Structures are given as structure tokens and as C-alpha cells.
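Form P-L/3: holo structure prediction, ligand 122.
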Amino acid sequence: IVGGYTCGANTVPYQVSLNSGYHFCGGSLINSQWVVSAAHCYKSGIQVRLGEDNINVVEGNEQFISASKSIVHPSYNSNTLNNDIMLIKLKSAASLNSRVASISLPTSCASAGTQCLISGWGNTKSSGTSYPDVLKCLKAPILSDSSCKSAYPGQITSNMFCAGYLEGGKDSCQGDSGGPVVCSGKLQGIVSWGSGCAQKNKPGVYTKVCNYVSWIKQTIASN
Ligand SMILES: NC(=[NH2+])c1ccc2nc(-c3ccccc3O)[nH]c2c1
Ligand SMILES: [Ca+2]
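OUTPUT (holo model):
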């Protein structure tokens, strides 16, 4: 996250870290045995880490659980990142309390102007790299579809939305992919892509979760 603030330990209780020997993507806990992330974060041998604040120090609230299966969206296109969403089922259910809790899926799609909370352990610099060990947060608004398509002509589909600042300085970044965009207590987006990070007129682009609720619910119900 570039230009964000330190969230504070376990203040984002649905945030997970996907680990394959190291943190490589974020994710959101949607129930005690399922995590939603970005399809471009897919790989085999994923261990889901819940209750994390400092990903390099075991502080006491962590739950490390392996994935039993991953399901990438049937229409995911890795060249355009359209339908960039995946589901991960945990080998055992996590123990939910105040520091590890699931986030609700939305009943309605959020509108431009909505302020949301984006979080992750991604790079905090726009030029250069500095990866933080504790969770960073950013409050940002969803932008109009007009501003979004104008910033990325020919690349935005109906399954994506932009959120951020056209002025730059604040954005999600590499290492934040797969994480949550929560607006009014509902998971409305998944950190998906951007052109660099925090650059002027290049806001972050997110998977529009409201368009996948039926698929998520039907998938969980049968697996
Ligand atoms: N600017 C942004 N909002 C952004 C967000 C997530 C990203 N994730 C990446 C990324 C880059 C290389 C490999 C995987 C990634 O998720 N770039 C990203 C950029
Ligand atoms: Ca830790």
C-alpha cells in the first residue's frame, strides 16, 4: 500500500496472507473454511495465514491452515485479468473471534463515491521497494466508471472498478493483490491490477465482487 497508515494489530480481522514459503498475496476470509483472492494469485502449495499483523513474527493470534482446494473462476482470462477472482477452501475450519472474523459478501454493488478500506502487506513505495512487515491500510473512494475507462482505455470490463486518487500518491501495490476492498462492512472488491503504483491518472483496478455472489455461494454450497 503506498501512502497508507499502519492499521494496528488485528483491526482488519478478515485479512489473510497467502504463503508458499513467503507472503505473495492477500485474501479475505468469507466464512470459517473459505477464502476469496485474485485468480492471478493462484499457485499450488498455499498455506493461508489468518490473525496476522507482523508476517515475520509469530505474535500470538495466528492460525496457519493449508488449502484443500483452489477454484479459479471458470472465465478467468490471464491476459486481460477479466474475472480475476478465486476461491480457496481450507483443510480445517478456522476459529472465529474478534481478531479473526469473516467479512460479508455484498447484496448490492457499491456506487462511485463510496469510501472503502483497502489493506495489505504490499510495497509502500511508487519508485523503489520497501515491503512492510505489518499490515497497512488505505481509505479510498470508488471512482466513476467514466474516470476509470478514461484512465485505462480499452482495458476496463463490467467486472472491474477503479478506486483511488487520480492525483496519485495513494494506491494499493505489488504484494497487495488478492486482498480486500471493504465498503460499509461488505467485501466489494479484490485488489487486482494497476499501471505501476500511485502514479497520477493511473488508479488501482479491482475485481467487482457483487457480480460474483451467485457463483461464490453456489460453489461453496457444493464443495
Ligand atoms: N497499482 C495497483 N493498484 C496494483 C495493485 C496490485 C498489484 N499487484 C501487482 C502485481 C505485480 C506483479 C505480480 C503480481 C501482482 O499482483 N501489481 C499491482 C498493482
Ligand atoms: Ca505474525
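COMMENT: The pocket of 122 (ligand 1) is lined by residues 171-174, 176-177, 191, 193-194, 197, 204 (CB under 6 Å).
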